[PDB]
C-alpha cells in the first residue's frame, strides 16, 4: 500500500488520566527514529515541535496528491497523536483543577525523521513537495536524502575538527570553567550548547 | 517563562557571552586555495573510415536550410553515391592532423557538413546550388590536393 495511511485524531482507547505537559519531549536531540529503515528520503526535523491532526492531514493530503504510487512508497515514522493537550473553557477564571482534554498531539524532537520515502525516484524529484511539506510543518524541517544526511553529519565532524577556536562549549561547560554552570542547564552538558529550548543551532559547533 | 517556549527565549547575559566566545572560527590558510594551481572512438573509427573511403571530398555551410529542404537536398544527393555528414568539428580538428591534412586544418570550423564522394556529381550539385542564392561551396581536397571553388568549377566541369 504505497500511500500514507490515515492518521486518526485520537486512538480508539482513550486516555482518561490527564497529563502534565512534560516539554522535555520537545527539547533536545531525538533518540527514537533518527536513521533510515528501508527508506531513501525523509523529512528531517531541524527542531522540535508538536504535530496536531491537521498537520498530519497536511502531510497525507499534500503528499498523496503529488505522489506516484507505482514509483514511490512512503511510511509514517511519527506515531498517532497520543499526548492529550487540555484547554480550560473559554473565558473562565483560574483554578478549579486542570482543564478538560481538548486535542491530542505528537511530540517530535530535533533530528527525528517524520515521513520516509522510497522507490524508483531520485532526490531532485522529491525535493519539491517535501520542501512544501517541510515548510508547512510547525518546526523548522528539511527534506533529507541518505547521502545528504551523512553529508551533513560529516560536515558537523568537519566543523568540530577544523575550528581554530580553543574554547568550545564542551570544554567550558563540563569543566565548569567560568563558574558557568550557574547559568547553564543540566541538559547543556549533554546537548552541548546546540539546543536552546526546542530550537536547534546547526551552524553552532 | 517556561524552559520550552514558542519564541526563542532571551539568554542570560553570561550565557550569551559564552555563546559568542565559543563561536566557530574557520581555518584561514596563508594563501587562498582558489588562487593556486565510446562515442568519441565511434566518431574516430567512423569518420577515420570515411577518410580512407573517399577519393574526393567537399563541404558547405549547411545550416541555412529548412528540415524538408534538407530532405530535398538529402534526396537529390541520395540520387548520387555522395554522402553528407553533420559531425562536430571539435573532434574533426584532431582528425585532420591524424590524417596528415595540414592544408585542411584552416578549413573546418563553424557549421559544416561533409560531402564525401568517389564519383563527382558535384557539378550537378552546383546546378542544385545555383537556384538558391546562398550556401556557398567551401573548398575540398581530392587525393591530398586541395580544391578551391575555382578548382570545383574546373574539376566539376
Amino acid at each position: 500500500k504505497p500511500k500514507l495511511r490515515f492518521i486518526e485524531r485520537a486512538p480508539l482507547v482513550p486516555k482518561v488520566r490527564r497529563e502534565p505537559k512534560n516539554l522535555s519531549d520537545i527539547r533536545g536531540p531525538s533518540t527514537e527514529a533518527t536513521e533510515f529503515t528501508e527508506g531513501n528520503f525523509a523529512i528531517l526535523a531541524l527542531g522540535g515541535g508538536y504535530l496536531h491532526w491537521g498537520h498530519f492531514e497536511m502531510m497525507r493530503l499534500t503528499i498523496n496528491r503529488s505522489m506516484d504510487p507505482k514509483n514511490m512508497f512512503a511510511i509514517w515514522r511519527v506515531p498517532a497523536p497520543f499526548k492529550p493537550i487540555t484547554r480550560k473553557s473559554v473565558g473562565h477564571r483560574m483554578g478549579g483543577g486542570k482543564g478538560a482534554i481538548d486535542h491530542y498531539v505528537t511530540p517530535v524532537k530535533a533530528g527525528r525523521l517524520v515521513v520516509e520515502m522510497g522507490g524508483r525516484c531520485e532526490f531532485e524529484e522529491v525535493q519539491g513537495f517535501l520542501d512544501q511539506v517541510a515548510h508547512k510543518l510547525p518546526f523548522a524541517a528539511k527534506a533529507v536524502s541518505r547521502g545528504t544526511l551523512e553529508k551533513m553529519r560529516k560536515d558537523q565532524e568537519e566543523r568540530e575538527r577544523n575550528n581554530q577556536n580553543p574554547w568550545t562549549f564542551e570544554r567550558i561547560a563540563t569543566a565548569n570553567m567560568l563558574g558557568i554552570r550557574k547559568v547553564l542547564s543540566p541538559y547543556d552538558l549533554t546537548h552541548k550548547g546546540k539546543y536552546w529550548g526546542k530550537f536547534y543551532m546547526p551552524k553552532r559547533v | 517563562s517556561k524552559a520550552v517556549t514558542r519564541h526563542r527565549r532571551v539568554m542570560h547575559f553570561q550565557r550569551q557571552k559564552l555563546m559568542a566566545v565559543t563561536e566557530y572560527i574557520p581555518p584561514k590558510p596563508a594563501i587562498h586555495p582558489s588562487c593556486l594551481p565510446g562515442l568519441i572512438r565511434l566518431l574516430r573509427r567512423e569518420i577515420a573510415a570515411v577518410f580512407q573511403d573517399n577519393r574526393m571530398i567537399a563541404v558547405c555551410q549547411n545550416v541555412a536550410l529548412s528540415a524538408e529542404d534538407k530532405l530535398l537536398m538529402r534526396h537529390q544527393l541520395r540520387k548520387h553515391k555522395i554522402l553528407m555528414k553533420v559531425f562536430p568539428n571539435q573532434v574533426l580538428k584532431p582528425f585532420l592532423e591524424d590524417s596528415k591534412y595540414q592544408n585542411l586544418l584552416p578549413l573546418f570550423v563553424g557549421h559544416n557538413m561533409l560531402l564525401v564522394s568517389e564519383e563527382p556529381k558535384v557539378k550537378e550539385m552546383v546546378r542544385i546550388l545555383r537556384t538558391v542564392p546562398f550556401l556557398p561551396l567551401l573548398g575540398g581536397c581530392i587525393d591530398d590536393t586541395i580544391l578551391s571553388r575555382q578548382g570545383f568549377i574546373n574539376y566539376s566541369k
Partner: peptide, 23 residues
Amino acid sequence: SREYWRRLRKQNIWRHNRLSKNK
C-alpha cells in the same frame, strides 16, 4: 555502438523528463 549511446541518450532524456515534472 551507435544504438548503445543512442539508448544512453534516451535514458538521459527520460531522466530529465522525470526531473522536470514539478517545474
